[PDB]
Design a protein around this ligand. Structure first.
Ligand SMILES: [Mg+2]
Ligand SMILES: [Mg+2]
Ligand SMILES: [Mg+2]
Ligand SMILES: [Mg+2]
Ligand SMILES: [Mg+2]
Ligand SMILES: [Mg+2]
Ligand SMILES: [Mg+2]
Ligand SMILES: [Mg+2]
Ligand SMILES: [Mg+2]
Ligand SMILES: [Mg+2]
Ligand SMILES: [Mg+2]
Ligand SMILES: [Mg+2]
Ligand SMILES: [Mg+2]
Ligand SMILES: [Mg+2]
Ligand SMILES: [Mg+2]
Ligand SMILES: [Mg+2]
Ligand SMILES: [Mg+2]
Ligand SMILES: [Mg+2]
Ligand SMILES: [Mg+2]
Ligand SMILES: [Mg+2]
Ligand SMILES: [Mg+2]
Ligand SMILES: [Mg+2]
Ligand SMILES: [Mg+2]
Ligand SMILES: [Mg+2]
Ligand SMILES: [Mg+2]
Ligand SMILES: [Mg+2]
Ligand SMILES: [Mg+2]
Ligand SMILES: [Mg+2]
Ligand SMILES: [Mg+2]
Ligand SMILES: [Mg+2]
Ligand SMILES: [Mg+2]
Ligand SMILES: [Mg+2]
Ligand SMILES: [Mg+2]
Ligand SMILES: [Mg+2]
Ligand SMILES: [Mg+2]
Ligand SMILES: [Mg+2]
Ligand SMILES: [Mg+2]
Ligand SMILES: [Mg+2]
Ligand SMILES: [Mg+2]
Ligand SMILES: [Mg+2]
Ligand SMILES: [Mg+2]
Ligand SMILES: [Mg+2]
Ligand SMILES: [Mg+2]
Ligand SMILES: [Mg+2]
Ligand SMILES: [Mg+2]
Ligand SMILES: [Mg+2]
Ligand SMILES: [Zn+2]
Lengths: 95, 60, 206, 23, 81, 155
RNA sequence: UGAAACUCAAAGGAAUUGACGGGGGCCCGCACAAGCGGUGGAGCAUGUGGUUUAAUUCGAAGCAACGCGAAGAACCUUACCAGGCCUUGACAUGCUAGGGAACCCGGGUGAAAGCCUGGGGUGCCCCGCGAGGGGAGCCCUAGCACAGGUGCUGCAUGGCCGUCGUCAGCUCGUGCCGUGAGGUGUUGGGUUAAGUCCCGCAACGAGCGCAACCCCCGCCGUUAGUUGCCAGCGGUUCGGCCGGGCACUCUAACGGGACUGCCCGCGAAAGCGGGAGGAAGGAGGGGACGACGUCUGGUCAGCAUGGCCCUUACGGCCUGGGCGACACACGUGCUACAAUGCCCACUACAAAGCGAUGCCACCCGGCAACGGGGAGCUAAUCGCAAAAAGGUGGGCCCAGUUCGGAUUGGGGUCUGCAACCCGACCCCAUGAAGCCGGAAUCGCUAGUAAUCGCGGAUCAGCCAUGCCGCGGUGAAUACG
């Protein structure tokens, strides 16, 4: 299942289920998301959100970075979505 | 709790169980060698420096 | 974050140990722990001497304690007095027969520890670091070598961002088992923090 | 087997002797 | 475990074979969880340390070979969820 | 094998029939390096190959091997949007390897309790054209054939 | 035809070095394919996410964090929690107002720490026959100046390390080309494991990387023999045991041998194919070594170090707890689901290591762990020692079983001041899940994977199924 690592930070059950909820967006593609792992982390500039996920058609890896933690997470999902649509459509150039 | 620590391992207290190797250079409790009196780090620095008698990079 | 120590890498080949003796289990630690007290006593006190290297010998209750050096004066002194004040204090900790010794080093600018601690003290002295480095190499190559390399790293000239400065003339082939590469390291503690210095001297093929 | 203390092969893995792997 | 000797600290040992002698009381505070409950202790209330608290245990002949610590447990659990 | 061609090792011939094909087989029987084991099985089976159906265990073995080697097989390419199973001939190298492999594999699925018996019987039947191995051959070969029209995509 | 308000610090053109393309050409790596063994399911061990807690100290974070720091968490370690204590400190240098020194032992008390306390008495340079005396070894108290801080920042740092990557690269000097950034060289053809080497060429050289020089293994020589040897004879109590010998085996130091050097074949050359001899050929196999740089990678908790912060407290001692908590989730691993297997009993063949408040022969008590005695060995000369799988012959007969050994009851041993929390082992009883594992996913090209045992560091003991080594048996396959 889904695991979240808050590294050097005091996180909460509420924001944990929020990240579970934002990641749910990838369920859209109807493709197996295998042992997804997010890592939330502070930084002097702003937060950092990483995720590494494997799927039947390959693996997703990406970093969000931003002042607001929530916009960092959104940025992370935005980057992940792209990667996922690419694994899903890539060889359709099958002419 | 640090430099006081290295002192506490010097004079040998109530029970002999409480004996633990520290090291001479750094006060390191972890990965001390009996033969050298050294940690694995200190050991390395010295060996490379040539200050450890007949001690050489292995290679077989 | 990769390179093997060019002295350690040649121990037994181009270069040889600075403590030479034999022991076995029960007393090695202690023998050794002596040397490194000796070394501390010396390197502190004998700092402004120059030097590089201290060879050390042992038989029984007998320490040969050799010292190579830049200027032997600050050891021997007037008539050979201080040579003895030391031959004492060594013996006080040695608890055994000390022999304080002085060998002079030939072109102290052909010696790695010596060249690197000069640029080192020059940096603590607030000097242009890039220029200090070209020079310290210049000096070496002028007095001969087959090549020379020198490395400073840290807040160079006090820069917030760390930086690392690099200069070399002629060959320094650290992959070659017979290099005769003399390498030495100093440390500059400035008002703002510590900078590392590394010198490399290619003396030639064995 | 190698996990079963009551057998030879058991004790061998475990590096001990007893009734089932004697000295 | 523990083959021949019967281990009680000889600190709370002393305390129990005194209180029994003259007019036997209760409330012996100890931090020794390592102490066996020796039949001379049978009945009393001893206050045993789990490390934040001294937890009282009535002694009974029900329990002797045990250790005084077993009855003042170190972890507060209550559950998950 | 990006670079050149990948050498095929030759093999020490065996100390009973002096024939490479037997050791390869014994090699294929082998499990966790225990070769002595792998030997007795083959030979024990060879006891049985003579005992029942009195004959030349060498002959029987070498027969059921030729009765297994697949002449044509499918190897599938992606072309456009579909993966075509494609008909191609097996190298003599690969046929041996596929011979021995299915033989053993099908042997070890027999109901016989003792391994060498399983080896005995599977070989006796394959000599005759009956068994798990043989099927796998005929099978692989009908799966080629029927694809005959993908024989143009052939390398 | 054709505004303005408002708004922005730009919008742009061409060219450059990169990075990228679901652009192309060429080419490498267990990258894929071919193939053998696993993981993902089971039970258990171990780290980590969570939650839990008085505390469950801390770091590590895609690949490169997760049997990682930890090559030994019951106390100690220990950095956290609770309670009891100390201040000039457990520790460094120095200065003083009292006393003294040094040192060994009880006491009273307390969980201990600490607090309170009865003793003996200081050599020495010494006015000394004397009281006494001065000094300063060294202790205390008072007082400072200070110590101490695993407290913060690895984006202020040194040092060392991981990584791309053993990948074939990265650059400099002068010259030439461009207004310039920058190009050239370094590209091109050919060949190599390789910016390897050959041939071209406005370039000609040079350096850091490749290779070689170092170690290990494989063959032969020498030097050498309290290890080896009826190889040789003799004795032989039958143990290479004695005599005797260094031929062996070995041991461990120094040499030799491989060079595409020789033949054929091709080429313009470098060099590719093939052959011979050779223990070994085309880098003989393995190691050590890892460019300019990257990841604002990693570590202030190994150490160091700037700066910020705390000074009867963020310092220091102690007893105890915790770091092992358990609804859960992942990662690494152990043992398995059996007959190519399990069990018993007899019987073989290694290597590298390690051993004095250690390795224990052998004898005895014990079913046993262990416990008694007790010899040898600073160890090629004693010991750990048994290697294991294998070999032999016997039992089991497809059964959740004579598979598997989790869990639990009870009884013991050993270390240790102490095995509640929390050790390992032994014996009796208990014999769980597990019938070969979803999506997904790892390793390995040969003495390799698989499988089998052995040693070592650290260490009282040990939670090692981990790690670092060592030999035994020994495959499969590579079109591409
Ligand atoms: Mg210990
Ligand atoms: Mg069993
Ligand atoms: Mg097994
Ligand atoms: Mg335009
Ligand atoms: Mg443009
Ligand atoms: Mg491309
Ligand atoms: Mg084209
Ligand atoms: Mg594959
Ligand atoms: Mg498979
Ligand atoms: Mg599995
Ligand atoms: Mg599992
Ligand atoms: Mg930290
Ligand atoms: Mg990243
Ligand atoms: Mg451990
Ligand atoms: Mg603790
Ligand atoms: Mg008392
Ligand atoms: Mg950094
Ligand atoms: Mg750093
Ligand atoms: Mg960090
Ligand atoms: Mg110009
Ligand atoms: Mg240029
Ligand atoms: Mg280039
Ligand atoms: Mg290469
Ligand atoms: Mg080159
Ligand atoms: Mg001899
Ligand atoms: Mg000889
Ligand atoms: Mg190299
Ligand atoms: Mg960072
Ligand atoms: Mg630090
Ligand atoms: Mg300042
Ligand atoms: Mg404590
Ligand atoms: Mg832990
Ligand atoms: Mg699971
Ligand atoms: Mg494990
Ligand atoms: Mg001996
Ligand atoms: Mg059952
Ligand atoms: Mg059973
Ligand atoms: Mg059990
Ligand atoms: Mg029990
Ligand atoms: Mg069941
Ligand atoms: Mg079954
Ligand atoms: Mg499987
Ligand atoms: Mg299996
Ligand atoms: Mg390979
Ligand atoms: Mg141990
Ligand atoms: Mg082991
Ligand atoms: Zn150390």
């Amino acid at each position: 299942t889904m695991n979240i690592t808050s590294k050097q930070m005091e996180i909460t059950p509420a924001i944990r289920q929020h990240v579970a909820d934002r990641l749910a967006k990838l369920e859209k593609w109807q493709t197996h998301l295998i042992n997804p792992h997010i890592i939330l982390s502070k930084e002097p500039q702003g937060f950092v959100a990483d995720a590494t996920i494997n799927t039947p058609n390959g693996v997703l890896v990406a970093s969000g970075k931003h002042e607001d933690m929530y916009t960092a997470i959104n940025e992370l999902i935005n980057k992940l979505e792209r990667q996922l649509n690419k694994l899903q459509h890539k060889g359709e150039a099958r002419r | 709790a640090r430099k006081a620590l290295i002192e506490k391992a010097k004079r040998t207290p109530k029970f002999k169980v409480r004996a633990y190797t520290r090291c001479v250079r750094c006060g390191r409790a972890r990965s001390v060698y009996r033969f050298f009196g050294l940690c694995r780090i200190c050991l390395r620095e010295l060996a490379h420096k040539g200050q450890l008698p007949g001690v050489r990079k292995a290679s077989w | 974050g990769n390179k093997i120590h060019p002295i350690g890498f040649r121990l037994g080949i181009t270069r040889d140990w600075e403590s030479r003796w034999y022991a076995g289990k029960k007393q090695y630690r202690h023998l050794l722990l002596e040397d490194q007290r000796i070394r501390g006593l010396l390197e502190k006190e004998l700092y402004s001497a120059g030097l590089a290297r201290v060879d050390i010998e042992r038989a029984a209750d007998n320490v040969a304690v050799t010292v190579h050096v830049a200027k032997p004066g600050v050891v021997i002194g007037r008539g050979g007095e201080r040579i003895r004040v030391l031959r004492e204090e060594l013996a006080k900790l040695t608890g055994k027969n000390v022999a304080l010794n002085v060998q002079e080093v030939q072109n102290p600018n052909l010696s790695a520890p010596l060249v690197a601690q000069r640029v080192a003290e020059q940096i603590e002295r607030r000097f242009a670091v890039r220029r200090a480095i070209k020079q310290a190499v210049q000096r070496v190559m002028e007095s001969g070598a087959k090549g020379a390399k020198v490395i400073v790293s840290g807040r160079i000239g006090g820069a917030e961002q760390a930086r690392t400065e690099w200069a070399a003339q002629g060959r320094v082939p650290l992959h070659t088992l017979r290099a005769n590469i003399d390498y030495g390291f100093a440390l500059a503690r400035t008002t703002y923090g510590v900078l590392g210095v590394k010198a490399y001297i290619f003396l030639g093929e064995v | 087997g190698k996990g079963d203390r009551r057998t030879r092969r058991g004790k061998i893995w475990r590096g001990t002797y007893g009734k089932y792997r004697p000295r | 475990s523990l083959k021949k000797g019967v281990f009680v600290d000889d600190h709370l040992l002393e305390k129990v074979l005194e209180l029994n002698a003259k007019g036997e009381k209760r409330l012996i505070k100890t931090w020794s969880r390592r102490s066996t409950i020796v039949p001379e202790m049978v009945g009393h209330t001893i206050a045993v340390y789990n490390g934040k608290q001294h937890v009282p245990v009535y002694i009974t002949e029900n329990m002797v070979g045990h250790k005084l610590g077993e009855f003042a447990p170190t972890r507060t659990y209550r559950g998950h969820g | 094998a990006r670079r050149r061609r990948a050498e095929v090792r030759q093999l020490q011939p065996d100390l009973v029939y002096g024939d490479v094909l037997v050791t390869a087989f014994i090699n294929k029987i082998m499990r966790d390096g225990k070769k002595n084991l792998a030997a007795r099985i083959f030979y024990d089976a060879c006891k049985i190959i003579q005992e029942k159906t009195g004959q030349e265990p060498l002959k029987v073995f070498k027969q059921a091997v030729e009765n297994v080697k697949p002449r044509m097989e499918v190897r599938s390419r992606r072309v456009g949007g579909a993966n075509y199973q494609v008909p191609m001939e097996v190298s003599p190298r690969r046929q041996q390897s596929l011979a021995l492999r299915w033989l053993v594999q099908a042997a070890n699925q027999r109901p016989e309790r003792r391994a060498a018996v399983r080896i005995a019987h599977e070989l006796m039947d394959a000599a005759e054209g009956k068994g798990g191995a043989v099927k796998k051959k005929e099978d692989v070969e009908r799966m080629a054939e029927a694809n005959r029209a993908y024989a143009h995509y052939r390398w």
